[PDB]
C-alpha cells in the first residue's frame, strides 16, 4: 500500500485551489505545455535531489546546510518562505469553513440568486443585462467577501470569516499537542464531480481550451516563470518542510522511487483538478452568453465560484457540498499541520539548553497565535487583494531561486562527484543519467534564462496581471526580497566573523564543509 501513502502525500490545496486559477490567469492551454515541460526536467530532479539531501544526513530544513555552511542563510531564506505561506494557507481554509458550515441549510445558498445581496446580472439555470454573473459568484463576491475598489480600502473587518479563522488556528494549535479517508477521498470526490460537468450542454468547448496549446505565449517569460512557480509550490520544494520530513526516513531507503511516485501522483491529481474544472468553465461560458476565456474574473478564487456551481447540479447537493468541503478543509488542515510542526522544530532545534527547550508547548502557541493576529487584515473587506499580492509575490519564484542556489550549491561549490557518490552509498546502483546530467546543467540554466527574462530584461507594466498601487507593488517585492536576501546576507556575515586575512583562501574554509558532515 506504499502507492496509497505516496498519493496522500503529495495532494493538498495548492493543486485543488491554487492551479485552477493559475491556469486560467496563464490562459489554460497555454500553462500547461510549459507546466509539461518544466515539471519533468526542473521539479522532478529537484525533488529528488531535496529528499536525498534530507535522508543523507538526518537533520532539519536547516542545520543540515554543513555541507557548505557559508550558504546556511538558504536554510533560513526557506523558513521565511514557509512563514509567508503560514500566514495566508489558513485564510484559504477558512473560506472552505465558511462555505462548509454555510452548507447545513436545507438547499445551498449558491443555488438561486434571489437574494438581498445580488443585483440584476443573473442567469440561472435552476431558476438592460451586460456580461451575467453566475449565482456562486455574487454570493462569493457580495456576500462571502464584501470586495473593495482598491487595496487601501480596509473599512469593516469581516466577523464571520474572523471567527472562522480563529477556529481553524485553534483546530490546528490543538492538533499539535496531542501528537483510507485521507489519499482515496479527495479521488472519489473529483470523480464524482467528473462524471458530472462532462455530460453537461458547452462542457467540450472549455475542455479542448484547457488542452489545445497557442505557440504564442509560451515564449513570453512570465508563463514559464508562473509554471515553475505551481511545479514548486505544489511539490513543495522550497517549502521548508521537504528537507525535515525526508529526515525521519531511513539510510538504506530508496528515495528515487518514492521521489518519482510522489510527483506522478501529484501531477496527476493536479490535472485531474485542473480537468474538473475547466468542466464547469465550459457550462458557465455556454449559459452566460460570454466566452470561456472571459467567464471568470482572473484572481485567487476561482475554486469557490467554479466548485461550488457543479455541486448544485448534483442530486440532493447539501451532502455533496459537505463532504467535498470536508475533505478540502482536511487537506488544508494536513498541510498546514505539517508546514507548522516544521517550522516549529526548526525553530526549536537551534535555542537554548532547557528554558527554550522543554516548554515548547508554550513557543507553539506564540506561532499559533502570531499567525492569526498576522491574518486579521487578510480576512477584511480587501482580503483576497492582500493574499493574491502575497501568493503572486512572496511565494511565486522565490521557492525557484532558493531552489536554484540549492542545485548549484552541492553540483558546483560541494562537488557534483562527492555527491554522486554519496547516493551510492545510499542505494544498490548510482543516480540515473538522466538525474545526473540534467542536475548539473539542465535544470539551473533554464532557471537562470528566467532569471535573465523576467527580471530585467522583460519586465514591463504588463508585469501586473492587476492594478496595484504604488505602495502594494513596493510592498510586495520587498517581501519576494526578503526571502531571497537571506542568501548574499548570512554570507556577509559568516566573511565578517570567519578567522583570516586575505579571505580568499578563507572563503574555501567558509564553503569547505564541515567535519559534522557524514
Ligand atoms: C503540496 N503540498 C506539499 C505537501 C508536503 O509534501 C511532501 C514532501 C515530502 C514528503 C515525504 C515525507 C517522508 C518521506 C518522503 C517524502 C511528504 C510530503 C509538504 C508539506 C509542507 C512542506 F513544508 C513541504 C512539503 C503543499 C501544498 O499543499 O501546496
Request: with cysteine.
Given at each position: 500500500e506504499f502507492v496509497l501513502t505516496s498519493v496522500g502525500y503529495?495532494?493538498?490545496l495548492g493543486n485543488v485551489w491554487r492551479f485552477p486559477y493559475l491556469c486560467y490567469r496563464n490562459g489554460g492551454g497555454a500553462f500547461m505545455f510549459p507546466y509539461f515541460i518544466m515539471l519533468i526536467f526542473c521539479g522532478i530532479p529537484l525533488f529528488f535531489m531535496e529528499l536525498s539531501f534530507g535522508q543523507f544526513?538526518?537533520?532539519?530544513?536547516?542545520?543540515?546546510?554543513r555541507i557548505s555552511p557559508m550558504f546556511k542563510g538558504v536554510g533560513y531564506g526557506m523558513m521565511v518562505v514557509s512563514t509567508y505561506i503560514g500566514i495566508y494557507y489558513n485564510v484559504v481554509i477558512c473560506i472552505a469553513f465558511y462555505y462548509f458550515f454555510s452548507?447545513?441549510?436545507?438547499?445551498?445558498?449558491?443555488?438561486?440568486?434571489?437574494?438581498?445581496?445580488?443585483?440584476?446580472d443573473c442567469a440561472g439555470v435552476l431558476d438592460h443585462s451586460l456580461q451575467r454573473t453566475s449565482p456562486s459568484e455574487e454570493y462569493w463576491r457580495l456576500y462571502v467577501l464584501k470586495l473593495?475598489?482598491?487595496?487601501?480600502?480596509?473599512?469593516?473587518?469581516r466577523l464571520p470569516l474572523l471567527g472562522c479563522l480563529g477556529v481553524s488556528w485553534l483546530v490546528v494549535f490543538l492538533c499539535l499537542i496531542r501528537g483510507?479517508?485521507?489519499?482515496?477521498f479527495p479521488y472519489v470526490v473529483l470523480t464524482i464531480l467528473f462524471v458530472r460537468?462532462?455530460?453537461?450542454?458547452?462542457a467540450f468547448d472549455g475542455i479542448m481550451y484547457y488542452l489545445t496549446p497557442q505557440?504564442?505565449?509560451?515564449?513570453?517569460?512570465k508563463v514559464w516563470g508562473d509554471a515553475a512557480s505551481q511545479i514548486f509550490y505544489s511539490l513543495g520544494?522550497?517549502?521548508?518542510?521537504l528537507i525535515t520530513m525526508a529526515?525521519?526516513?531511513?539510510?538504506?531507503?530508496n528515495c528515487y522511487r518514492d521521489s518519482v511516485i510522489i510527483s506522478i501522483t501529484n501531477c496527476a491529481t493536479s490535472v485531474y483538478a485542473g480537468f474538473v474544472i475547466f468542466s464547469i468553465l465550459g457550462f458557465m461560458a455556454n449559459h452566460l452568453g460570454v466566452d470561456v476565456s472571459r467567464?471568470?474574473?482572473?484572481?485567487?478564487g476561482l475554486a469557490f465560484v467554479a466548485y461550488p456551481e457543479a455541486l448544485?447540479?448534483?442530486?440532493?447537493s447539501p451532502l455533496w457540498s459537505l463532504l467535498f468541503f470536508f475533505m478540502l478543509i482536511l487537506l488544508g488542515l494536513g498541510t498546514q499541520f505539517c508546514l507548522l510542526e516544521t517550522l516549529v522544530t526548526a525553530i526549536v532545534?537551534?535555542?537554548?539548553?532547557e528554558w527554550i527547550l522543554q516548554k515548547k508547548t508554550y513557543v507553539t502557541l506564540g506561532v499559533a497565535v502570531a499567525g492569526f493576529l498576522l491574518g486579521i487584515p487578510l480576512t477584511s473587506q480587501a482580503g483576497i487583494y492582500w493574499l493574491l499580492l502575497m501568493d503572486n509575490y512572496?511565494?511565486?519564484?522565490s521557492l525557484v531561486v532558493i531552489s536554484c542556489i540549492m542545485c548549484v550549491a552541492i553540483m558546483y561549490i560541494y562537488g557534483h562527484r562527492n555527491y554522486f557518490q554519496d547516493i551510492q552509498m545510499m542505494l544498490?546502483?548510482?543516480?540515473?543519467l538522466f538525474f545526473q546530467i540534467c542536475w548539473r546543467f539542465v535544470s539551473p540554466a533554464i532557471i537562470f534564462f528566467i532569471l535573465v527574462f523576467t527580471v530585467i530584461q522583460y519586465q514591463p507594466?504588463?508585469?501586473?496581471?492587476y492594478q496595484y498601487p504604488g505602495w502594494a507593488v513596493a510592498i510586495g517585492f520587498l517581501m519576494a526580497l526578503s526571502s531571497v536576501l537571506c542568501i548574499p546576507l548570512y554570507a556577509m556575515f559568516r566573511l565578517c566573523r570567519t578567522?583570516?586575512?586575505?579571505?580568499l583562501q578563507r572563503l574555501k574554509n567558509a564553503t569547505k564543509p564541515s567535519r559534522d558532515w557524514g
Amino acid at each position: 500500500e506504499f502507492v496509497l501513502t505516496s498519493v496522500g502525500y503529495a495532494v493538498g490545496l495548492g493543486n485543488v485551489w491554487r492551479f485552477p486559477y493559475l491556469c486560467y490567469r496563464n490562459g489554460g492551454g497555454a500553462f500547461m505545455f510549459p507546466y509539461f515541460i518544466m515539471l519533468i526536467f526542473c521539479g522532478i530532479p529537484l525533488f529528488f535531489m531535496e529528499l536525498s539531501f534530507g535522508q543523507f544526513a538526518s537533520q532539519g530544513c536547516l542545520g543540515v546546510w554543513r555541507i557548505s555552511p557559508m550558504f546556511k542563510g538558504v536554510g533560513y531564506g526557506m523558513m521565511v518562505v514557509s512563514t509567508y505561506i503560514g500566514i495566508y494557507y489558513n485564510v484559504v481554509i477558512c473560506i472552505a469553513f465558511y462555505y462548509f458550515f454555510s452548507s447545513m441549510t436545507h438547499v445551498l445558498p449558491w443555488a438561486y440568486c434571489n437574494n438581498p445581496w445580488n443585483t440584476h446580472d443573473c442567469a440561472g439555470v435552476l431558476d438592460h443585462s451586460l456580461q451575467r454573473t453566475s449565482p456562486s459568484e455574487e454570493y462569493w463576491r457580495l456576500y462571502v467577501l464584501k470586495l473593495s475598489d482598491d487595496i487601501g480600502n480596509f473599512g469593516e473587518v469581516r466577523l464571520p470569516l474572523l471567527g472562522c479563522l480563529g477556529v481553524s488556528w485553534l483546530v490546528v494549535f490543538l492538533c499539535l499537542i496531542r501528537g483510507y479517508f485521507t489519499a482515496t477521498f479527495p479521488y472519489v470526490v473529483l470523480t464524482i464531480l467528473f462524471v458530472r460537468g462532462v455530460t453537461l450542454e458547452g462542457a467540450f468547448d472549455g475542455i479542448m481550451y484547457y488542452l489545445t496549446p497557442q505557440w504564442d505565449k509560451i515564449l513570453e517569460a512570465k508563463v514559464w516563470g508562473d509554471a515553475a512557480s505551481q511545479i514548486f509550490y505544489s511539490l513543495g520544494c522550497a517549502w521548508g518542510g521537504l528537507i525535515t520530513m525526508a529526515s525521519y526516513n531511513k539510510f538504506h531507503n530508496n528515495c528515487y522511487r518514492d521521489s518519482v511516485i510522489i510527483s506522478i501522483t501529484n501531477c496527476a491529481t493536479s490535472v485531474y483538478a485542473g480537468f474538473v474544472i475547466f468542466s464547469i468553465l465550459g457550462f458557465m461560458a455556454n449559459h452566460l452568453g460570454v466566452d470561456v476565456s472571459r467567464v471568470a474574473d482572473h484572481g485567487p478564487g476561482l475554486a469557490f465560484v467554479a466548485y461550488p456551481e457543479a455541486l448544485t447540479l448534483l442530486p440532493i447537493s447539501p451532502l455533496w457540498s459537505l463532504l467535498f468541503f470536508f475533505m478540502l478543509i482536511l487537506l488544508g488542515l494536513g498541510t498546514q499541520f505539517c508546514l507548522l510542526e516544521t517550522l516549529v522544530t526548526a525553530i526549536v532545534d537551534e535555542v537554548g539548553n532547557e528554558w527554550i527547550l522543554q516548554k515548547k508547548t508554550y513557543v507553539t502557541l506564540g506561532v499559533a497565535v502570531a499567525g492569526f493576529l498576522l491574518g486579521i487584515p487578510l480576512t477584511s473587506q480587501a482580503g483576497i487583494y492582500w493574499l493574491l499580492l502575497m501568493d503572486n509575490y512572496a511565494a511565486s519564484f522565490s521557492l525557484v531561486v532558493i531552489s536554484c542556489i540549492m542545485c548549484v550549491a552541492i553540483m558546483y561549490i560541494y562537488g557534483h562527484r562527492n555527491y554522486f557518490q554519496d547516493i551510492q552509498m545510499m542505494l544498490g546502483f548510482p543516480p540515473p543519467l538522466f538525474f545526473q546530467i540534467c542536475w548539473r546543467f539542465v535544470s539551473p540554466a533554464i532557471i537562470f534564462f528566467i532569471l535573465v527574462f523576467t527580471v530585467i530584461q522583460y519586465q514591463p507594466i504588463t508585469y501586473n496581471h492587476y492594478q496595484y498601487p504604488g505602495w502594494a507593488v513596493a510592498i510586495g517585492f520587498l517581501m519576494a526580497l526578503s526571502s531571497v536576501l537571506c542568501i548574499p546576507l548570512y554570507a556577509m556575515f559568516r566573511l565578517c566573523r570567519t578567522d583570516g586575512d586575505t579571505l580568499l583562501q578563507r572563503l574555501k574554509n567558509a564553503t569547505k564543509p564541515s567535519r559534522d558532515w557524514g
